[PDB]
Design an enzyme around this catalytic site. Structure first.
Site, PDB file in Angstrom:
ATOM      1  N   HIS A  41       0.800  -1.221   0.000  1.00 24.59           N
ATOM      2  CA  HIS A  41       0.000   0.000   0.000  1.00 24.59           C
ATOM      3  C   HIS A  41       0.853   1.301   0.000  1.00 24.59           C
ATOM      4  O   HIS A  41       0.288   2.390  -0.117  1.00 24.59           O
ATOM      5  CB  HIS A  41      -1.074   0.015   1.092  1.00 24.59           C
ATOM      6  CG  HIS A  41      -0.580   0.159   2.503  1.00 24.59           C
ATOM      7  ND1 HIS A  41      -0.220   1.391   3.024  1.00 24.59           N
ATOM      8  CD2 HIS A  41      -0.517  -0.760   3.490  1.00 24.59           C
ATOM      9  CE1 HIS A  41       0.119   1.166   4.280  1.00 24.59           C
ATOM     10  NE2 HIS A  41      -0.050  -0.111   4.609  1.00 24.59           N
ATOM     11  N   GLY A 143       2.600   5.839  10.451  1.00 25.44           N
ATOM     12  CA  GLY A 143       4.014   5.769  10.105  1.00 25.44           C
ATOM     13  C   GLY A 143       4.686   4.464  10.498  1.00 25.44           C
ATOM     14  O   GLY A 143       5.824   4.197  10.092  1.00 25.44           O
ATOM     15  N   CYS A 145       3.661   1.446   9.631  1.00 27.15           N
ATOM     16  CA  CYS A 145       3.451   0.386   8.634  1.00 27.15           C
ATOM     17  C   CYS A 145       4.781  -0.177   8.168  1.00 27.15           C
ATOM     18  O   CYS A 145       5.716   0.588   7.959  1.00 27.15           O
ATOM     19  CB  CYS A 145       2.634   0.908   7.461  1.00 27.15           C
ATOM     20  SG  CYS A 145       0.915   1.275   7.863  1.00 27.15           S
TER      21      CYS A 145
HETATM   22  C1  RM3 Z   1      -2.942   7.845  14.191  1.00 34.90           C
HETATM   23  N1  RM3 Z   1      -3.762   6.659  14.014  1.00 34.90           N
HETATM   24  C2  RM3 Z   1      -5.183   6.903  14.183  1.00 34.90           C
HETATM   25  C3  RM3 Z   1      -3.330   5.652  13.206  1.00 34.90           C
HETATM   26  C4  RM3 Z   1      -3.327   5.803  11.815  1.00 34.90           C
HETATM   27  C5  RM3 Z   1      -2.827   4.840  10.991  1.00 34.90           C
HETATM   28  C6  RM3 Z   1      -2.279   3.642  11.507  1.00 34.90           C
HETATM   29  C7  RM3 Z   1      -1.699   2.621  10.693  1.00 34.90           C
HETATM   30  N2  RM3 Z   1      -1.807   2.739   9.294  1.00 34.90           N
HETATM   31  C8  RM3 Z   1      -2.909   2.595   8.522  1.00 34.90           C
HETATM   32  O1  RM3 Z   1      -4.012   2.272   8.962  1.00 34.90           O
HETATM   33  C9  RM3 Z   1      -2.690   2.902   7.052  1.00 34.90           C
HETATM   34  C10 RM3 Z   1      -3.724   2.257   6.158  1.00 34.90           C
HETATM   35  C11 RM3 Z   1      -4.954   2.862   5.942  1.00 34.90           C
HETATM   36  C12 RM3 Z   1      -5.948   2.215   5.226  1.00 34.90           C
HETATM   37  C13 RM3 Z   1      -5.726   0.950   4.710  1.00 34.90           C
HETATM   38  C14 RM3 Z   1      -4.499   0.359   4.916  1.00 34.90           C
HETATM   39 CL1  RM3 Z   1      -4.249  -1.285   4.392  1.00 34.90          CL
HETATM   40  C15 RM3 Z   1      -3.490   1.001   5.607  1.00 34.90           C
HETATM   41  C16 RM3 Z   1      -1.125   1.531  11.345  1.00 34.90           C
HETATM   42  N3  RM3 Z   1      -1.103   1.353  12.673  1.00 34.90           N
HETATM   43  C17 RM3 Z   1      -1.670   2.285  13.425  1.00 34.90           C
HETATM   44  C18 RM3 Z   1      -2.273   3.461  12.918  1.00 34.90           C
HETATM   45  C19 RM3 Z   1      -2.821   4.470  13.745  1.00 34.90           C
END
Ligand code: RM3
Ligand code: CL
Lengths: 305, 297
Positions: A41, A143, A145
């Site tokens: 992604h 961040g 990921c």
């Molecule tokens: C700041 N917060 C609310 C987040 C934001 C994001 C977080 C995160 N990443 C995602 O979700 C990115 C994404 C969004 C949609 C689909 C996919 Cl496959 C990937 C990982 N881990 C924690 C997180 C926490």
């Protein structure tokens, strides 16, 4: 003596963490030999996320669109391919700090260490378990990921998880290192919810055996139970069914403490009925399910107190 | 989202762990530059025992390599073994002494080989509730200050209650303990109040607000309640330190204190805070801010 939630020393994994950038998106990658692994992604925009055609998005990318940073050094991308939900970026330098490794897929209830990273820089290490609903209760911000889950049993690092996304409930979902998700999840913004979670019964039992090894016997009782009768009770408390494999796996702990598995199941049944009653087991007021039978034999001694 | 007990990445410390042997005793040492630090109990009149030892009695192993000891001296309860080779993996470091309530990471080792990492706090009674077996002596506690590793603890012994005792890296014990086999007990422990408050702020940040109330309290009235429940006194410094968390959540420190007062008298009532049925005191205000901001090393 003492029982703690312990993680594997993160050193061998820290030497693999890199920063992967594609356009505006920046996340972590795992640099092993001349390949960098990261969630696919990274090629997506936030708009693309609802229904992305990854094969269509990747055919439009060139090697110079992927910026990879290893410390202060920039790695040159010389090829790219996709394996399920992981993007494999071929780089021109092999990681000199590459440890002995294996890509392993784990089953629910299995535990592992997570080295949480932001911008290819490791910020912390914690221990956690793959829940029965295939989610992990992690501690992740945006961040993170590409952060990886691993076990360093003996001298080989077994990569078992790569972080991909946070679900609406605050729990996390990801893949094994071959890009296959754990659970019915997809790398899409579509309405996805974690199924109802259950307590890993075999792990709670292992943790009750670790309590007996550390000298705590207050919860033990004079009863035993059939496997079938225990599962009928446990099901009502949202506990995972205990299988004959689970019983066989608890054999070494049963032998060491002198308490039969179905005898320990009777203690667990009673704990579920009465509660702790102001008491704690290994400094905990709740029944802990994030220590496997293997973890307990690894951390605890052999001479029972 | 999510709140976990998180340890600092142990990599910079792993490159320092060595195995120290003197006679039949085998424990861990910390190899920084050309000096190996380990508990002096590896060799009681310690000066009399040490004057009888020669450099070749100390066997030091760094991986599969044997290090040549070229000198030895004692600083309080730590033995400093001068070695021929300087550790090429020596990180930027400092020896720091910590105060009760402060937290740190422990890299538990057996035979100079790191087996696990965990996070823990220096209790008000100067003991640490660790996870150690025989052979763990010389295991170190540390924090990472940006890029500099701050060594704050070295493990020496286990007390009869199962808790642990050790020294700073200058060999000065934490607490009224001595490094010998004698009747030593940990004093009555207390709950680190500023840490519980920080953890309640982290619960609010994660969307857990059930314990909040409309009430406030004086610092003096809260401490009268803290004394009754074996809680450490909350000082004006503690309140000032919780300022950033108070500002971020919109809940004044003495407002959060009236929430803790109600939790102390009434309990959780079948509820949990951050998946816990007990009030957690092993996260400092800085740990909460670091884990809810994403600071990297
Ligand atoms: C700041 N917060 C609310 C987040 C934001 C994001 C977080 C995160 N990443 C995602 O979700 C990115 C994404 C969004 C949609 C689909 C996919 Cl496959 C990937 C990982 N881990 C924690 C997180 C926490
Ligand atoms: Cl598994």
């Amino acid at each position: 003596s003492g029982f703690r939630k312990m993680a594997f020393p993160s050193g061998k994994v820290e030497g693999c963490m890199v920063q992967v950038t594609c356009g505006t998106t920046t996340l972590n990658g795992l640099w092993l030999d001349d390949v960098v692994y990261c969630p696919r992604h990274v090629i997506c925009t936030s708009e693309d996320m609802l229904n992305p055609n990854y094969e269509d998005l990747l055919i439009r990318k060139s090697n110079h669109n992927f910026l990879v940073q290893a410390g202060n050094v920039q790695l040159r991308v010389i090829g790219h391919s996709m394996q399920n939900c992981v993007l494999k970026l071929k780089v021109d330098t092999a990681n000199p700090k590459t440890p002995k490794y294996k890509f392993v897929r784990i089953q629910p209830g299995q535990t592992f260490s997570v080295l949480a990273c932001y911008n290819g820089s490791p910020s912390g290490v914690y221990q956690c378990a793959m829940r029965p609903n295939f989610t992990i209760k992690g501690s992740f911000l945006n961040g993170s990921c590409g952060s990886v889950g691993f076990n360093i049993d003996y001298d080989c690092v077994s990569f078992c998880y790569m972080h991909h996304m946070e679900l609406p409930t605050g729990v996390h979902a990801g893949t094994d290192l071959e890009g296959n998700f754990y659970g019915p999840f997809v790398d899409r913004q579509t309405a996805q919810a974690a199924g109802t979670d259950t307590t890993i019964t075999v792990n709670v039992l292992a943790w009750l055996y670790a309590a007996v090894i550390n000298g705590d016997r207050w919860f033990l009782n004079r009863f035993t139970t059939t496997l079938n009768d225990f599962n009928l009770v446990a099901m009502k408390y949202n506990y995972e069914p205990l299988t004959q494999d689970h019983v066989d796996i608890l054999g070494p702990l049963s032998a060491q403490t002198g308490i039969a598995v179905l005898d320990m199941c009777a203690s667990l049944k009673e704990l579920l009925q009465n509660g702790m009653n102001g008491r704690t087991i290994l400094g905990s007021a709740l029944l802990e399910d994030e220590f496997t039978p293997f973890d307990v034999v690894r951390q605890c001694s052999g001479v029972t107190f």
